[PDB]
Symmetry: C3
Amino acid sequence: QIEIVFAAGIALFSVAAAYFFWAYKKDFNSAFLVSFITIISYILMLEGSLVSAGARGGEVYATRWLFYGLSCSLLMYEIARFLRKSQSEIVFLMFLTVIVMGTGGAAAYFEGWYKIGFFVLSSVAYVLLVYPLLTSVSPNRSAVAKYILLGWTGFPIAFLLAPDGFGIITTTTAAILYLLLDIFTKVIFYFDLHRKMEVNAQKV
Amino acid sequence: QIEIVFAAGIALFSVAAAYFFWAYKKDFNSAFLVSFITIISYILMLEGSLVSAGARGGEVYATRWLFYGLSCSLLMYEIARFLRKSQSEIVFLMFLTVIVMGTGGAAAYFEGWYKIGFFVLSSVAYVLLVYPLLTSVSPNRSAVAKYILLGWTGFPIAFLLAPDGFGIITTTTAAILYLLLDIFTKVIFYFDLHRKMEVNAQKV
Amino acid sequence: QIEIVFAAGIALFSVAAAYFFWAYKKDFNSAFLVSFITIISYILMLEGSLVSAGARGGEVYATRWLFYGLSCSLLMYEIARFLRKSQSEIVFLMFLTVIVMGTGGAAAYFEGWYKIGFFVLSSVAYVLLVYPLLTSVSPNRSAVAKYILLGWTGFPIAFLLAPDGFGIITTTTAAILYLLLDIFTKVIFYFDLHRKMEVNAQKV
Ligand SMILES: *C\C=C(C)/C=C/C=C(C)/C=C/C1=C(C)CCCC1(C)C
Ligand SMILES: *C\C=C(C)/C=C/C=C(C)/C=C/C1=C(C)CCCC1(C)C
Ligand SMILES: *C\C=C(C)/C=C/C=C(C)/C=C/C1=C(C)CCCC1(C)C
Ligand SMILES: CCCCCCCC/C=C\CCCCCCCC(=O)O
Ligand SMILES: CCCCCCCC/C=C\CCCCCCCC(=O)O
Ligand SMILES: CCCCCCCC/C=C\CCCCCCCC(=O)O
Ligand SMILES: CCCCCCCC/C=C\CCCCCCCC(=O)O
Ligand SMILES: CCCCCCCC/C=C\CCCCCCCC(=O)O
Ligand SMILES: CCCCCCCC/C=C\CCCCCCCC(=O)O
Ligand SMILES: CCCCCCCC/C=C\CCCCCCCC(=O)O
Ligand SMILES: CCCCCCCC/C=C\CCCCCCCC(=O)O
Ligand SMILES: CCCCCCCC/C=C\CCCCCCCC(=O)O
């Protein structure tokens, strides 16, 4: 069952990486790297060796969150640059991004008060991560808010519902939802904003 | 017993991270990041899944040294910048710092000639790490020597005594000593030097 | 048997790191770092805890490929700078380098269609990695082609033959071949090019 979801993820991001490589300039291509890393992550989840038991008889694939530490750092780089954050602020927000994903994987893997403790830690770093973005004085703020509020913030809600958290929804339901969020935050994100982000980076 | 030490560490660095975030400029805040990472590390040590047997019936929490690879890289960044090292020298010293901590975790985890071999490797990198700092022509050298000599260099001595090394002192004694060294090198360090380091970074 | 090969590797790169540290400028010394990391990697392979079964009754030491993610990123930095790639292109190629090694370790460790899938992924990233180098308009291109074609590209061929891939050659034969390739790409590389690369970096 869930194998079909993972294979869908492998196929979609293989096509996405191929399109992003050929369609964009042969230089630093973050859209290609984000998609290529996501393929690696979906193959490892499909292989099935790093599953763990989750809430209410579900399963957890905690390497998903560890891989987001890399792929979402690339996305935060693009987002913060698009909002013309300073260099030292871009670095800071990339660090918070790694911290959010790393503690989130820990929250998914561990149990009891440790799940709760890690989830809280991750949530604090996350609030500190998105406050400077959502209150940015950049005119690009609105174009960026929709991915932060709908996509990025969709993940902790999904997590709480999934076997990663309380286990209200099944492992396959969570995985489909994670894949939709992945497509929105990693593929649509670039279809939508690639042109504006590219023009912006050339002016700074 | 040792749970009380780890919980003390979680509480102290939670308070420290909160103070450093609010008291300092809302930009790249290394003092906040160093403390936040240390919380993560103490929670993982408290959870207890990554303990291993150490010398003389003691225990080893080798993930402490792996986490120092990240948090101490941030500290070395501040220290080398404070001494006005060049950019390429700052990078070099951050690499040596990761190497020291990474091989140190290996030394703590493994046994026999491998403990000795990794300890030596870590000690060589460490000598190369601190020689340019202790012989710096910067007038900030003295302000920096005390953390290097008393705090940073306290760790390999503690390690040799602890179950990580020969096991002369118990796991709880080592942990208390590691926590004191942590407080000195990560919290007092900033109480002491934050102002001078901040003024210095604004001039370069 | 294979212990002798690993100990040869530890000894050679210990001597190489010592020569590179003393002979070159006391600044960012990538030749020293590459060799020092390779020592760490050979000691871990000698210790023997992270072996896995490979093809035709052979063994796989997959941490070799994970460590190349770090040491080869340093080499790609030098190579791309020597070819006067832009900064954003240098970063891109270092990312591809980590991806090649990381998926390569996965390919070595896993089995069946997962070995094949990861090997292909690694091979695609690798083609994208070396195409901008082999078609560079730099006059340094030829001096660089020989390490890419003979050394870097030697590894996937060796991998396919080794127990990492089809298991046509024994684990000890593969290890000797990996060590020769290591010496060529990490030690001869600098004996050959250190002067030209150093003079080049001073002009950019
Ligand atoms: C795949 C792409 C993205 C942008 C994924 C982003 C994921 C998050 C923002 C997840 C955040 C979490 C929080 C805030 C707290 C619990 C654990 C999570 C990792 C799900
Ligand atoms: C938590 C903050 C700091 C600054 C910790 C620093 C740790 C060291 C300098 C440890 C060094 C080691 C050496 C030199 C050799 C044996 C293994 C150790 C990691 C303890
Ligand atoms: C130790 C130094 C170097 C430069 C090692 C380089 C290794 C490679 C270029 C290996 C590439 C691989 C490919 C392309 C595909 C299968 C897995 C490998 C990692 C062997
Ligand atoms: C050509 C431009 C770059 C294209 C981007 C990446 C393209 C993806 C290529 C190959 C993907 C291999 C997929 C692995 C299949 C795994 C199946 C399995 O393990 O069961
Ligand atoms: C615990 C989580 C594990 C994953 C680790 C991820 C760490 C990688 C972090 C950041 C990668 C650096 C991205 C730099 C983009 C710069 C682009 C440019 O300069 O053009
Ligand atoms: C920057 C701070 C990074 C913090 C990293 C936190 C480490 C994450 C903790 C646990 C995730 C490991 C996933 C386990 C894989 C499944 C294992 C199994 O098969 O039982
Ligand atoms: C508000 C500014 C930022 C504050 C810095 C971080 C504050 C720490 C917040 C929550 C810490 C959660 C502690 C986890 C408890 C673990 C207990 C257990 O696992 O038994
Ligand atoms: C094996 C050890 C595992 C831990 C890995 C740690 C690697 C992280 C290293 C360095 C982080 C980069 C810090 C950059 C600070 C720059 C600050 C600024 O530019 O304002
Ligand atoms: C930059 C070079 C970095 C080198 C990294 C060296 C790897 C460190 C080796 C071992 C540390 C792993 C800690 C083991 C956790 C406990 C496992 C257990 O529960 O038995
Ligand atoms: C002095 C300049 C720097 C020199 C570079 C590094 C020199 C290497 C030094 C010590 C290497 C220790 C080798 C470890 C032996 C392992 C043997 C074993 O584990 O069986
Ligand atoms: C999965 C593979 C694990 C290994 C991770 C390796 C990641 C490290 C990557 C790059 C290190 C950065 C090198 C920077 C060199 C800059 C030199 C300079 O500025 O003078
Ligand atoms: C940048 C993308 C990086 C991707 C990282 C891929 C993770 C590599 C996967 C597996 C390698 C782990 C090696 C296992 C050690 C031997 C374990 C054993 O003793 O059974």
